[PDB]
Structures are given as structure tokens and as C-alpha cells.
Amino acid sequence: AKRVAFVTGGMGGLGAAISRRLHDAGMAVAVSHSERNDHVSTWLMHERDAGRDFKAYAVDVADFESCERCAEKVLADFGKVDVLINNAGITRDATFMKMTKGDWDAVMRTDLDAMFNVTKQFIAGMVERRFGRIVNIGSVNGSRGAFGQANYASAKAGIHGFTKTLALETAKRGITVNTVSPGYLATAMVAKILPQIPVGRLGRPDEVAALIAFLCSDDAGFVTGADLAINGGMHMS
Amino acid sequence: AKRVAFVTGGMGGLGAAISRRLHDAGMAVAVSHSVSTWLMHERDAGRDFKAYAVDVADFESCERCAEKVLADFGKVDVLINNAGITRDATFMKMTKGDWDAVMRTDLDAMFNVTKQFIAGMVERRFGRIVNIGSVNGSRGAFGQANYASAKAGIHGFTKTLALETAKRGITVNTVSPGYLATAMVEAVPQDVLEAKILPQIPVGRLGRPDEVAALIAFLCSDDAGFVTGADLAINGGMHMS
Amino acid sequence: AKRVAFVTGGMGGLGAAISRRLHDAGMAVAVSHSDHVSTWLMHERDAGRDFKAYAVDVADFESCERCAEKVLADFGKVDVLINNAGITRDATFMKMTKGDWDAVMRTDLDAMFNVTKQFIAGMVERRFGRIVNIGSVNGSRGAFGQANYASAKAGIHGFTKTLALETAKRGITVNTVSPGYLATAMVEAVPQDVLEAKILPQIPVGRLGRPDEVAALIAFLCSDDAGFVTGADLAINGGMHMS
Amino acid sequence: AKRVAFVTGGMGGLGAAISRRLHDAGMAVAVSHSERNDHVSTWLMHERDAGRDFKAYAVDVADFESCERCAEKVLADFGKVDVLINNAGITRDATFMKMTKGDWDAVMRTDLDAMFNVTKQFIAGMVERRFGRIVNIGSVNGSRGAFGQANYASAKAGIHGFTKTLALETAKRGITVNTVSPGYLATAMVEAAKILPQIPVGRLGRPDEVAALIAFLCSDDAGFVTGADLAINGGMHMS
């Protein structure tokens, strides 16, 4: 039975690279989104033109019930989910002194609470079948802290604490949970940044996708509760 | 003036120990809570604390509370974000409410409480913000995906807020305690903690809250102005990295 | 121009797993050794693999320079360098001798300098390099009876970070791979009931790691998809240590 | 029954700051050096002008026998050593391309081997007595790596490996072992552009600040801090 992967924000700069890599690894891939049908349709179509057959689901990862409804559809089509990539999130940048409580919640409830809201929908299947791969997308900015992002940095760091506890809980049931923590990436939304990066360039979404593919393969069963940093050397210990 | 400290959860096991050390260091200490008797034993003890009610999960409650505090003291120089709770459960069994109660109180507290006092610390070019983490955010812990997520997130906050206040005479650090001899933990039967707890701690004993308070009293001094964005681990050797 | 890897301690439990993966990936592999390399080479040959092997004392700069002379002559160049060679000389710090200390410092840490020095200039010139240094989970958490081993392995990561910084603009990455307890012949010699009593409880995943798994992660690190990983410590320890 | 501290490099910018802090905390303090008697006796004089009596001792921390000799003297004089501060150290900066074996060896044999060479001479005392404090001085360059310092970064990183293991082995005998990891300091050395933009607080640390921290760790309120790395780097490095 084919391995199934669910990639939240699966149509993003990094979600779409991850999805393509996981499909090319031979998995049945579902991607999550909150966009209008035309966006989703054109995306699905061009992917179909590049040899790739995706199925997409609408979700609000900040909303538990919505995750429940989303998971329902996914499980009905693929019947199980083996590989979960918590990749969906948002930024709401403000200096701390300017930050509104609204800036704060949008980022906590979405970026961090997604660890509970989404992973809750799939964890029983993984434990039942004694197999799973959960990769939580962190950020270099949860490691080093960032100016203007007290909220996004608190969420990415919290994400690692969740990675570690889940790994401890699921280790003995064939499931590994890891944080992958990318630096700045040549995405669509993305001289104060580049000199920050020893390697002297943005990382490619596909590079991060490659590392993720490895973590979800059968060769990475001894990596759990780890933070994999892939940042162009922008941050070290 | 005189140095003024606000210890959220200031009457709790660690909070109490902390409030007493900042007091004995020459600070005028306000203690937050969610009372009368504790305050009696304390003035009695030799110290004068002012208690405020607050719900650190609730911004509004925080902002109201700061108003009383400041009305009374003029300023806040030293902020100890110590208030926290656990709602433990395996992930499989953890409810939306377990998860949520912990995020709001333990991690949202960082924004809510801190938002109230940052303004004056920057104006007065001085501040000591000390966020209480946990060794359980550092290494992770069974039954506590919520707690470890919240406590780990606190250090993202520490690190960003130390970067933003760096040139303003303010330091922001996390202190991560291991297992402490608070009244809760001392209720666990001797044989149970010798079986499940003490063998985790190379030093072979619970850490006193006073010790943690002593470390924090140091970080809040002028001598520690070059310590910022650090996580100081005081866990008896339970975790190293 | 088939990519070339050099693997110090290349016939050892983990070293051997590494050489096989890198060989199966299409890389030309040279392995280093400090007795029965004949036998090791023979068993590899039986398994369908061509390795060239080289004697060296990694703790000896002049020894490493001679070894690289021969390797470079043979293979033309080294694109991938695996500093895997390592010994332990365990003792409580109170019983440990200067010999226990020196043996581990020279072989495990000085080696980082002695070896990498030989191959660095070629990588800089070609504007491509991969360098992976093997650390240890005992570098990260420290370990009873291994003040020398922990010190050496911990020190390897200081090395990796500095060389990553220095080399990042010349197409070179440098990382540390820190493995947990692995099922090597040595360790498999342990009675299953001692392994179960004392070793496996430390490991949340509940088994030793297979030297091939660690080798697989390193093979990913050495590919054209790993260019944006550098100065990194990748822990592959089955949940034994987190931070 | 006063506590005795021994600070190697006890006359350097940081070393001297530390010795002053420990003395003012009530400790008898011995200091190690490898300087000529001229320099030493004068250093001693100004300190004594300030109302501090130190005893100073020659040692080569990169040399086991030397350390053994130095330590007998200390011990004959003060009877014991309760607190050890491994502070002595050097640098031999170069790019990896340019660094020589000698550059490498001088940094490793001195900065990292000192953990063994020095601490071996005092560890037994602490254990028998069931009380000790060992503070090993690392470096922010240990944590982040530093261009030009492949040797010194390795030595300084190596030092926490040592800290964690010895914290483990001694934790039941009332001893803590910690690394204190300072960023760039105001030492007559650095008071000799590139640096400060690295430091979020926008200034050099005072050696005295580092010494305050270490004075806390050596005190009786810090017995639950062990195997830890305390960073005091102005924000220069975080997690």
C-alpha cells in the first residue's frame, strides 16, 4: 500500500517543493490550502502537466474543527496518512512595542496551535499501524530570535518543544517527529539579509524539500526529536 | 529611586522564593495572583509585598493590573514572568482545553504582561525581564506536549525581545529550572521520587526554589547587564546540551 | 568525473557503512586505516565493491600528508571528506591517565586538522566540497567515564562551525553528524540481556541504530541537494538526546 | 575555615577580574601565571595597595608535570583548593588554509589539555571533602565558530564536553562543573568597527561582569547549577 503524505500549506513556496519531492519519492500526496478554487485549480492543472497528480483540501489549521473536517476527506480518499508535514503558517511582523494582541494571536493560534490542531487528526492512524513520519517546519528565526517577530519566533521555538515531546511519546510506536528549521529561501513572498548568510544566497525550496524527503524515508528511523537546520550557515549552535 | 520588581505568580512556590530574594536585594516587590493570609505571613516574615489580582492569559486583565501596580510604585524595573500551569495528558488523550489553557497562561502571558511594562523600561533605559522556562521545554517531556511547547516558545520570545531592547539598557533572559522542592512536589511519597524523580538528577536531590531565586536575583542586578538572550539552566545536571 | 570520497577509519563499524553507501551512490571511495584490511577488502570484493585502502596515523600530520599524496595520485582529487576515524580510552577522570587523554585528543580531534588540511585546497580550487565530521551523542550530553572522548567529540563541532564559516563561499559545506548507540560488531558482542538492561532503556526508539542509517544521512549530506546545510550538527541518536 | 580559590591566568584582564571578585567574596585566592618575577611582584603590589593579598604561582597549564609542581606549592601554602577557575588560555589565529601544525598544537595543548593538566591536580581534594566548584572558561567563539580560529573554537567547544562529563562524574560529591562562555571583553588586550556590530548591546563586556557571574556560580547558592554553559556575551550568540 502506497505511502500517503499530507502537506499543509502544500501549495506554498516550500509546500509545493515538498509535495513534488514526496510524490517523486513515490508517495500519494495530499496538500492543504486556504485558497479559492481557481487558484487551486490552476495549480493542480500545471502540476498535472509536469507529471504530478495531487489532491487538495481546504483547511484553517488554526481551527481544530476545520482540521477535523479536512482530515475526514483526506482519510476518505487515501484511507490513511503516513507522513505529515506541518508546513502551513503565517507572519505578522511588528516590533514588540508596536505589536497588537491581534498580531500575536494570528501567529500563535495559526503557527503553533497547528501542532495540536492538525497532528491530532492523524496521530491515531500512525500509532495504530505502528508507523509514521511527522516533520514540523521550524525556522532559523526560532533559533536565533528575530527583530520584529516576537510572535513568529515564539511559535517556531514552541514548535520544537512539541517535536521533542511527541517524539518521546511515539518513539516506541514506529513514528519519528522532527523539526526542520530552514533559513531564508528563494520563495515568491521573500542587502540586510544576504550578508547574514555565509553561503551567500537564498536556499532553494527544493533543497529543503530534499532533506524532508530523506527524513520521511525508511532510512531515517533513528532520527527523532531532532532539529535539522538548513540555513546556509546563517545560524550555528 | 528604588528598584521595583513585578513577579507574576509571586506567591507560588517559585514565585514566593523569588519575591523574597528580590526584596532582600533592596527591591520593592509587587506580587501578582489569580492572598491575604500569604501577605500576613510575609509582612510577619519581615517583608512588605503588594499583591495584585490578574489573569495573565487575558491582556485586558493584565493592562488593568499594570495600572494599579504603576499607580502604586511609579515604575517597573524588574519583570519576572513566573506564572505558569500544567494540564498534563498524552498527546492522543490531550483535549483542546488542556492545550489551550496552557498556551494562554504560559506563553501568551509573555506578550500580555510584558506589553504593559516595556514602555517605561525603554524610557528609563533600564530593565530586567526574566522569563521562567523549564527543563521540560529543553529536552521535552512525556505527558506535556502543551507545556513543553509553551516553555520552549518562551525562549523564542526571550531571544527576540533581547535583540529589540539591546541598546536600551534592558536585558531579557530565560531561566530553565529542573525539579524543585515546591510544596506540590514534596507531596509525592519519598519512595516514588527516589524511584521516578531523583535518579534523573545527577546531583541526587530536588533543587530548592531559593537557589533558583538566588540565580534570578543575580540576573536582575547591574552586574548582569552583559547577560542577554541567554537560557540559564539550573537543573541539577538533569539536562546538558 | 565521478565524485571522490575519502573515509577515515573507513573499515570500522560506522566507517564501513559509510564507504558502502557512498560507493553505491556512484562515488569512487578511498578508505583509511591504521592489521586485517586484507580480509575486510576481500569481503567487500565478494559483495561486489571496489575500495582502495590506505594506511595512516590520523593523529600525525606528516602521516596524513603522505597518505593524501597517494590518494590524490590515485583518484585525481577528493570532493568528499569523512572524518570518521575515532577511538575511545575510557576511564573515570580520577583514574584517567595522560595517555588515555592524549591518545583520544590526537586521534579524535587533532585528526580534524591533520586530515582536512590535506584536501582543503583542492576543494577550494574546484569551488566544490563536502566535509562531514563524525561527532557523538556523548559529545552532546557528556558521558560517564569519557572526559577525553566527550571533550574531543564536543571539540569537533567547534571545528566544523569555523571551517563552515571560512569555506561557505567556495562551494564547500561542513557538518557534524552526531550518532547515538549503533549496532556495530563491537557493540553486538554485548549479551542481549545487558543491551536490554542498560543500553536500550536510554533509547526511546527502543533499538540500536544501524550503522547503515547513519551512513544514509551522511550520503544525503554529501549530495548536490545538501548545499544549504553547513555549520550544522545533525543528531541521529534514536531520541537518546534532544535540546 | 575560609574557602580557597585557584585562578589560572589569574593576572589577565579576565583572570585578574575574577581573582578580585573571589577575594572580595571572602575566599583566599591563589593565582597562576607564566610571567617574569618583575611583572608578578608588581601586580601583587598594586593589589596589596588595594587591600588584597594574593599568592601567585608559576605554571605551564599545557604541561602535566608543571601543573603537578605548581599544585603542591599551592596546596602546601593554602592546605586545599575548594574552587578552581580554569581561565588560562591563548590564541594563534589564522585561516584554516594558512594555520600551521604549531598554531594548532599550541592552542589545543594549552587551552583544552589544561582541563586535564590542571583539574587532575585538584579534583581528588574536592571529592574527599564533598564540596567543589570548577568553572571552565569557554568562549562565545566556542558556540558560533569564529573565522580565523579553527583551533581556538575547537578547544573552546571541546571544553564544554569536558564540563558536562565531569559534572556527571562528580555531581554526587557536592561539586558543580560549569562552563562560562563570555563574548568580547574590555581587556587591555582588545582596547588595543568589526566587533561591536556583532554585539547586540553595542559594547564590550567588562571583565568584572564575567567575574560577578563566576562569583555567583562558586557561591553556596549555585549548587543546582551544573553541567551548564552560562553565556555572557552581550547577545552576540543565542540558542
Side-chain angles (χ1 to χ4, degrees), chain A residues 1-35 37-38 40-47 49-100 102-127 129-188 190-191 193-237, chain B residues 1-42 44-95 97-122 124-183 185 187-189 191-195 197-241, chain C residues 1-97 99-124 126-185 187 189-191 193-197 199-243, chain D residues 1-34 37-44 46-47 49-100 102-127 129 131-171 173-188 190 192-193 195-239:
Chain A
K2 225 179 206 193
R3 293 228 170 139
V4 170
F6 183 49
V7 175
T8 70
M11 305 195 162
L14 179 69
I18 285 173
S19 301
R20 312 188 190 100
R21 277 280 179 160
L22 286 190
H23 168 284
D24 287 347
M27 312 187 177
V29 171
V31 305
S32 90
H33 70 79
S34 64
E35 261 96 26
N37 282 309
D38 292 315
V40 172
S41 181
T42 310
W43 186 85
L44 249 12
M45 189 198 205
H46 297 155
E47 286 320 315
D49 285 352
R52 290 189 207 86
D53 22 325
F54 295 115
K55 283 201 210 93
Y57 307 68
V59 80
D60 176 8
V61 301
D63 174 89
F64 189 85
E65 284 67 41
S66 162
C67 292
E68 221 152 14
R69 289 193 295 272
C70 177
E72 253 225 319
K73 276 153 79 214
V74 168
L75 292 168
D77 303 3
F78 290 92
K80 76 191 180 172
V81 161
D82 287 300
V83 165
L84 175 75
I85 309 315
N86 290 127
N87 165 74
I90 58 181
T91 62
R92 215 104 312 191
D93 302 346
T95 39
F96 179 67
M97 197 114 69
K98 296 223 190 62
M99 193 160 287
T100 68
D103 281 323
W104 179 263
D105 295 334
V107 168
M108 291 313 92
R109 313 308 112 196
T110 301
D111 296 355
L112 179 61
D113 278 355
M115 301 288 123
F116 194 76
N117 297 332
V118 168
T119 311
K120 283 290 285 186
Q121 316 311 333
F122 306 99
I123 180 73
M126 291 176 188
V127 170
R129 307 171 277 279
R130 290 294 133 89
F131 180 85
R133 292 292 192 272
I134 290 154
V135 187
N136 304 142
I137 298 313
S139 173
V140 74
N141 286 357
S143 307
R144 68 183 183 154
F147 197 68
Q149 302 198 284
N151 55 348
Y152 182 68
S154 288
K156 298 313 210 176
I159 281 173
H160 198 35
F162 173 86
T163 288
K164 283 175 272 164
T165 287
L166 197 47
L168 288 184
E169 294 196 352
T170 63
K172 233 160 207 80
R173 285 172 334 200
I175 299 169
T176 69
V177 181
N178 295 288
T179 311
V180 168
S181 286
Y184 292 69
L185 289 202
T187 73
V190 160
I193 292 301
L194 292 190
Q196 263 177 126
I197 301 182
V199 124
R201 63 165 176 94
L202 302 198
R204 301 182 312 258
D206 179 58
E207 294 177 277
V208 182
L211 168 68
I212 300 171
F214 174 75
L215 289 174
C216 299
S217 83
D218 280 305
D219 284 327
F222 202 58
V223 189
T224 200
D227 176 35
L228 299 96
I230 174 152
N231 58 31
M234 181 181 354
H235 187 257
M236 313 181 175
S237 300
Chain B
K2 188 169 140 200
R3 209 145 265 173
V4 167
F6 188 47
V7 188
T8 69
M11 312 177 211
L14 194 46
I18 293 174
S19 291
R20 296 175 193 129
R21 275 281 181 155
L22 293 179
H23 178 72
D24 295 359
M27 313 221 157
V29 179
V31 292
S32 101
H33 70 80
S34 152
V35 170
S36 249
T37 314
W38 183 81
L39 244 28
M40 179 263 294
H41 295 126
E42 203 38 71
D44 165 2
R47 326 190 167 77
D48 194 57
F49 293 111
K50 298 220 156 43
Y52 306 91
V54 70
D55 164 26
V56 302
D58 161 9
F59 188 86
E60 326 311 315
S61 170
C62 287
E63 189 188 62
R64 289 191 293 283
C65 158
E67 306 174 21
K68 308 185 74 122
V69 171
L70 294 161
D72 287 0
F73 288 86
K75 55 188 197 175
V76 150
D77 295 306
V78 185
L79 176 63
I80 317 311
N81 290 132
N82 164 257
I85 56 169
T86 51
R87 290 296 193 276
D88 284 355
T90 48
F91 188 61
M92 214 95 50
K93 289 186 181 181
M94 185 169 287
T95 78
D98 294 322
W99 178 267
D100 219 65
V102 168
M103 293 301 112
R104 304 183 73 258
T105 298
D106 289 15
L107 176 62
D108 286 341
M110 298 304 132
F111 182 89
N112 294 343
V113 183
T114 306
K115 223 72 214 333
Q116 303 328 318
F117 306 106
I118 192 64
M121 290 178 181
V122 172
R124 284 181 309 269
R125 286 310 107 94
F126 181 82
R128 295 303 189 248
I129 294 151
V130 181
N131 310 137
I132 305 312
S134 187
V135 61
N136 286 350
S138 302
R139 71 191 169 156
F142 184 88
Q144 314 184 312
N146 48 352
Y147 195 62
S149 277
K151 283 320 186 167
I154 280 171
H155 198 64
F157 175 89
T158 290
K159 291 175 302 196
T160 291
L161 191 59
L163 286 186
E164 289 190 4
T165 59
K167 307 185 153 68
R168 290 151 151 165
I170 314 195
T171 69
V172 190
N173 301 289
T174 305
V175 163
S176 309
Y179 290 149
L180 306 185
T182 65
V185 169
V188 189
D191 47 285
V192 175
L193 62 126
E194 308 187 350
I197 307 299
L198 289 181
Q200 289 186 63
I201 314 166
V203 163
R205 71 181 170 81
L206 296 183
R208 311 179 285 270
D210 190 39
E211 297 174 281
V212 185
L215 169 58
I216 287 171
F218 169 78
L219 287 159
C220 290
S221 75
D222 291 345
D223 282 345
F226 210 55
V227 187
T228 200
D231 165 34
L232 309 137
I234 178 169
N235 58 38
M238 189 178 341
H239 178 266
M240 299 171 193
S241 61
Chain C
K2 204 193 215 181
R3 202 142 294 168
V4 170
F6 181 61
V7 179
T8 68
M11 326 203 179
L14 172 64
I18 292 156
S19 316
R20 300 177 189 110
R21 274 282 170 159
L22 290 185
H23 164 104
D24 298 359
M27 296 194 215
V29 186
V31 302
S32 101
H33 72 88
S34 140
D35 168 60
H36 87 275
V37 322
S38 276
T39 304
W40 183 90
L41 256 355
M42 170 192 90
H43 300 292
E44 295 329 304
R45 220 187 319 88
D46 295 349
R49 294 190 183 88
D50 188 12
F51 294 114
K52 271 88 190 87
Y54 301 86
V56 66
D57 179 2
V58 284
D60 185 340
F61 187 102
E62 303 290 330
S63 193
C64 299
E65 178 162 33
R66 278 190 306 274
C67 172
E69 282 188 44
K70 291 151 58 75
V71 181
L72 290 181
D74 286 342
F75 290 80
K77 55 141 181 188
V78 176
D79 311 273
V80 160
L81 170 66
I82 311 308
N83 281 127
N84 163 72
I87 58 173
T88 68
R89 299 285 186 263
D90 286 12
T92 70
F93 172 79
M94 204 112 45
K95 289 178 182 190
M96 167 177 307
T97 70
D100 295 331
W101 180 269
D102 284 347
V104 167
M105 288 305 102
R106 308 182 92 250
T107 301
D108 290 26
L109 192 49
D110 287 345
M112 303 292 127
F113 187 83
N114 304 334
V115 179
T116 312
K117 211 64 173 99
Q118 308 312 324
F119 302 113
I120 184 97
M123 293 177 183
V124 172
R126 281 172 303 256
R127 305 281 146 207
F128 175 90
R130 290 285 179 277
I131 297 175
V132 183
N133 308 138
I134 300 302
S136 164
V137 66
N138 287 347
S140 302
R141 56 185 188 142
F144 175 100
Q146 307 191 299
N148 53 356
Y149 191 69
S151 289
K153 294 302 205 177
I156 273 161
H157 197 41
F159 182 85
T160 281
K161 296 178 282 201
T162 296
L163 198 55
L165 290 168
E166 291 195 20
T167 64
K169 304 248 164 38
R170 280 130 137 211
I172 298 168
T173 61
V174 181
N175 304 286
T176 303
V177 173
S178 303
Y181 290 165
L182 301 180
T184 58
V187 164
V190 179
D193 71 277
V194 173
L195 160 95
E196 296 192 0
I199 307 318
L200 296 175
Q202 289 182 60
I203 308 176
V205 84
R207 50 167 184 95
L208 300 165
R210 295 180 301 267
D212 178 67
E213 290 182 288
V214 184
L217 152 63
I218 294 161
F220 167 84
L221 287 182
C222 301
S223 58
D224 302 330
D225 291 326
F228 206 67
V229 180
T230 188
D233 188 37
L234 316 120
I236 178 158
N237 63 42
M240 208 178 329
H241 188 257
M242 308 169 182
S243 78
Chain D
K2 206 187 207 161
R3 254 177 226 162
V4 174
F6 170 65
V7 181
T8 71
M11 294 178 356
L14 180 54
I18 294 157
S19 309
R20 293 174 193 132
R21 272 283 176 163
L22 289 175
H23 167 97
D24 300 351
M27 295 199 205
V29 177
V31 299
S32 103
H33 66 82
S34 74
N37 223 71
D38 288 284
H39 183 336
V40 179
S41 107
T42 315
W43 182 88
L44 258 8
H46 294 135
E47 288 306 326
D49 283 337
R52 297 189 191 100
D53 195 72
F54 305 107
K55 307 183 185 56
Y57 297 83
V59 78
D60 174 7
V61 301
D63 183 79
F64 187 92
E65 284 58 47
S66 176
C67 289
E68 189 148 25
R69 281 194 293 276
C70 157
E72 305 182 6
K73 289 167 70 102
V74 160
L75 279 175
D77 282 16
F78 297 73
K80 56 182 169 38
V81 171
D82 301 283
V83 166
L84 166 63
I85 301 305
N86 289 129
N87 169 71
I90 54 180
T91 61
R92 303 272 194 265
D93 302 349
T95 61
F96 191 74
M97 207 73 34
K98 291 168 172 164
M99 183 174 290
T100 65
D103 283 339
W104 178 266
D105 286 343
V107 172
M108 293 313 128
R109 316 291 89 232
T110 315
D111 297 7
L112 183 42
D113 296 359
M115 300 299 123
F116 183 87
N117 293 349
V118 179
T119 314
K120 279 296 256 172
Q121 320 296 343
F122 310 100
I123 191 66
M126 288 167 182
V127 158
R129 280 187 298 280
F131 177 89
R133 299 279 187 270
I134 308 186
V135 176
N136 300 146
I137 270 67
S139 174
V140 76
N141 288 347
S143 306
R144 52 168 199 166
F147 196 106
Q149 322 200 300
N151 43 9
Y152 181 77
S154 301
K156 296 302 186 175
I159 287 166
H160 197 42
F162 180 82
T163 284
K164 296 177 293 193
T165 298
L166 199 60
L168 290 167
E169 295 185 13
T170 62
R173 291 305 302 179
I175 297 160
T176 61
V177 187
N178 299 295
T179 310
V180 164
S181 290
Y184 295 142
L185 298 186
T187 52
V190 186
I195 316 336
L196 294 157
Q198 298 185 26
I199 312 184
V201 286
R203 49 141 185 127
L204 300 175
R206 274 193 275 123
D208 189 55
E209 281 175 295
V210 184
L213 173 59
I214 292 156
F216 176 71
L217 295 179
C218 302
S219 86
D220 287 338
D221 296 330
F224 199 71
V225 185
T226 201
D229 175 37
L230 306 89
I232 173 148
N233 63 25
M236 206 176 326
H237 182 266
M238 292 182 184
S239 263

